[PDB]
Amino acid sequence: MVGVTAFGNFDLASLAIYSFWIFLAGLIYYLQTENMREGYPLENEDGTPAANQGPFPLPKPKTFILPHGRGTLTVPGPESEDRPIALARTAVSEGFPHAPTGDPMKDGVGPASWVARRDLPELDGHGHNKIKPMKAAAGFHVSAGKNPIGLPVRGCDLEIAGKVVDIWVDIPEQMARFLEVELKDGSTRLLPMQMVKVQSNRVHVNALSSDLFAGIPTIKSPTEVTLLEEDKICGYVAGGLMYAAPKRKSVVAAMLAEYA
């Protein structure tokens, strides 16, 4: 016959849960403001600060020390695109799309967008270039799957745009990142590995018709690629899904349908 709880210790538990909700409100505030370290303050469509920034204030800045003498990054910090954006309003009020003023693939807007990232290669923990053509990566070779090197490369118009001449590999992560494709004029381009289908007789690229391969952004040194160059290449390729759709839906509709 011993038990000292009945009079007011189920209060504890009430205390605990009440405390938890207070803690959780605090946590969500912390997390949301942590997640405002990029892209804020919000802007009007003309790039000026928006009047309504929401109920959460910007966090105090933090600084990342970057390795290999690359400096630091402090965020939140001044935001700017640092590149021309070739788009114009299509309506007289906010919230409508912005039409490309030129060729959106060439101009790098919409799904063809790129970010003005640093024009230096990503580096591994030893300060060497993270990504290298396999011919220059000592000891690296295809270890499984069909080796794409030497295969013709086909675009979504079902025409051959070139031939694979190498694989660019991530050295520290031991993975394939790009295929290097040589074009009809003898120059090469990089294609993201995520955007190609390696088949037994060919590499197929659904994102681009063959005529758009020459427009893929080129790299300035043939044995390295900078973060800026990767953004431009990947943005352009993915942009083909929307912008080469005329040259894809025309073909894969005249390819099938013949009976009636």
């Binding site: 802007e43 928006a50 912005h98 959106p104 063809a112 993915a238 899904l241």
Partner: protein
């Protein structure tokens, strides 16, 4: 208002229905045909729930509960106050979720990104449908579905589970649970690993993915890598829900007795069924 980097992505195109008619935003939200459809379904659903609350005679969110038709109605319609609201609300919920996934697809197409997100969401929608549609249809009555109420739906899981003894004994449930636990473990480790690299010891330079691999190799002798971990989190969470839907779709249909007795199949294998000793001899 727009994120600072947002304008260059707000181009026309990517819609699946309606061309440019609904190709616009409201504040941060993209609309599209399916944004309109979601709004319509969600609004109607919420209104009908509010009506069910009135018929029930309460506005307390902890008391409001919308029930499917009693079992006597089988798979037919029911009067509104007697299960019909549940049925219409369920059609609205389904319209709203499916519209939400298809609006996500329009957003993928505008942004030139893969479709992995709404593909993943479609697993959640299929688990919901297993419980409110697929399983009740196979069992022959809407009344086997859960009710829409904050606490009442929990009474339904308890009552449903206890119908088959300790539901722990459902083997597809065991697997689903293992995927849930393993997913949370992996989410903790993934979050922690990226953060521990991005936020190293005071005054040290950011670590690299080389260090993330090194840390896991040191710790357990294997690192799945930065691509692998996101493949994994996706696979674990989708597998959890796949095995959840499976564990329920087989329950009350192909297996309807006490789940614990299912395991007798193993104990009763000829070559050891009759050996004495142990727990089952």
């Amino acid at each position: 208002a727009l994120l600072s980097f947002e304008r260059k992505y707000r181009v026309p195109g990517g819609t699946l229905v309606g061309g440019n008619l609904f190709d616009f935003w409201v504040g941060p939200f993209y609309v599209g045909f399916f944004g309109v459809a979601t709004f319509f379904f969600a609004a109607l659903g919420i209104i009908l729930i509010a009506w069910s609350a009135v018929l029930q005679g309460t506005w307390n969110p902890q008391l409001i509960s919308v029930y499917p038709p009693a079992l006597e109605y089988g798979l037919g319609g029911a009067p509104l106050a007697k299960g019909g609201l549940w049925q219409i609300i369920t059609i609205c919920a389904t319209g709203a979720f499916v519209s939400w996934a298809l609006r996500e697809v329009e957003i993928c197409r505008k942004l030139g990104i893969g479709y992995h997100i709404p593909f993943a969401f479609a697993f959640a929608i299929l688990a919901y449908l297993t419980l409110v549609l697929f399983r009740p249809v196979m069992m022959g009555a809407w009344g086997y579905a859960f009710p829409y109420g904050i606490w009442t739906h929990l009474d339904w899981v308890s009552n449903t589970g206890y119908t088959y003894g300790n539901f722990h004994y459902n083997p597809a449930h065991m697997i689903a649970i293992s995927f849930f636990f393993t997913n949370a473990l992996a989410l903790a480790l993934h979050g922690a690993l990226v953060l521990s690299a991005a936020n190293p010891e005071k005054g040290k330079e950011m670590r690299t993915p080389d260090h993330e691999d090194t840390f896991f190799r040191d710790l357990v002798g294997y690192s799945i890598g930065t691509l692998g971990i996101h493949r994994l989190g996706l696979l674990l969470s989708l597998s959890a829900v796949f095995f959840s839907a499976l564990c329920m779709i087989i329950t009350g249909t192909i297996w309807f007795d006490q789940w614990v007795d299912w395991w007798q199949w193993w104990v009763k294998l000829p070559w050891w069924a009759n050996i004495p000793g142990g727990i089952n001899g």
